[PDB]
Amino acid sequence: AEKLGSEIKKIRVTQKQLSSEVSRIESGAVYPSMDILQGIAAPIIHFYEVLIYSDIERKKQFKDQVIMLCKQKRYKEIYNKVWNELKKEEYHPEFQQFLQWQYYVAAYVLKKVDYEYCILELKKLLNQQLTGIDVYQNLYIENAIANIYAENGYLKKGIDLFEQILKQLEALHDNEEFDVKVRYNHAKALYLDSRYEESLYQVNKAIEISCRINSMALIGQLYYQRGECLRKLAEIEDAYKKASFFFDILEMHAYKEALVNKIS
Amino acid sequence: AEKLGSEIKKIRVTQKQLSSEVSRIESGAVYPSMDILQGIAAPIIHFYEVLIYSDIERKKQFKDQVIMLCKQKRYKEIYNKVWNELKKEEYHPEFQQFLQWQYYVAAYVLKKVDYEYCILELKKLLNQQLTGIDVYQNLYIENAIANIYAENGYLKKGIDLFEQILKQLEALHDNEEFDVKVRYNHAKALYLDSRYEESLYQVNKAIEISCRINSMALIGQLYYQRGECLRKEAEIEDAYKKASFFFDILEMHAYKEALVNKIS
């Protein structure tokens, strides 16, 4: 917003001669006029290019800010930060969708809204969009809808939406870290429905990805499900010892507590 | 480049809203004029916003294309792809710098240029810039210069440039995956200079990050250096067994071959 005349002040290396009001552009009081903007460096795209790069810097700051709190599980502080930013009257169909997605789910987590009310308020952002920035944003929403059928028992419809993501996965496999989040959530519910068949296939497909993308993010939880999926049907001890290893090195003691009560 | 009148054709959902040549904007034969651009949706930033998002889509495609080949170690195919793209007369100080960085290093790898000639051709990109997209791009070049002092023996000056990156790491810790690449390369040379003291500190500092960022990218190679740094028997066996585990699961047999010749 202020970056317009910021690099312009330094690109000068003549402020009096550029043909009075010109000196307000280097501060950032008012946005430059249609005809006045053309007068600079006389390229036309670069004066606008910086405005997007300054925007996407602070947008990604916020997008990476909600991540830290999500892991911290500080939902009320997400809810507040996502409301105060939303409170500021700003127009962006792609950024608003994310903000309001995080708002509805946070409210659902904080038990402010119903499981169904949340589904409805999420569905509307999904079925009515014009996203040209991040195509994966709408995919995370579907997982957000699908994974909130688990502690609800509508998993039969949940799996349908998880299988619906597999079809969209083949269309430019750019982000694999998300596959691991979906495949793990898919395999989490398959074991809950007590379908021990393709629950193993989904785990061993995410384990395959985690080893090639070098992300041990869900790996501990992934081998724990392999050891539990193999538990009902030498290979069981193999996956059991593999998981237990990660839990301590990744500093996850909470999930390490319910390990000894499962082995012996 | 063609995305200008692409969403415009669909945003119409009006056809004869002039106030003839207007129809070629849908194809993208010529870029729209300054005064003609104003007569659209009647916002002004959105017609330009798509042009950057279409640009950064295909730019990132290429940036993520060089990555796959780098791991594949298919340097001549990088060298060719980076030359053919460079051959196309395009003006971008940030994209050109990357292209030519990959070109000089590839030539150095293919043994086309000297270690010093490479240093010089890399140094010029570093000392003359105006970055406003990837701030970490010039840091990768520094590491590229610094890590190419190893099979050269000027590691004393190499470490100076590696320590120079530590100061720049505190200034907004965005990419932790790069820290792991630098800290590992720093600790690789410290062991080569035969300074077994802070070679252990640097490994365990990156091991700490790899566990918090959930990236097992250099973890196998990191524990292998911990086991070798501790080598010059209880703590040594601990780091030795830890590394060996990863090598097979990450499908790295080449580095697994020189394990049995080190344990017994």
UniProtKB/TrEMBL annotation, chain A:
Keywords: Calcium, Metal-binding. Signal peptide: none annotated. It comes from the Bacteria. It holds the Pfam family HTH_3. One of its GO terms (molecular function) is metal ion binding. Residues 8-47 form the HTH cro/C1-type domain. SMART domains: HTH_XRE. InterPro entries: Cro/C1-type_HTH, HTH-type_regulator_Rgg, Lambda_DNA-bd_dom_sf, PlcR_TPR, TPR-like_helical_dom_sf. This is PlcR protein. It comes from Bacillus thuringiensis.
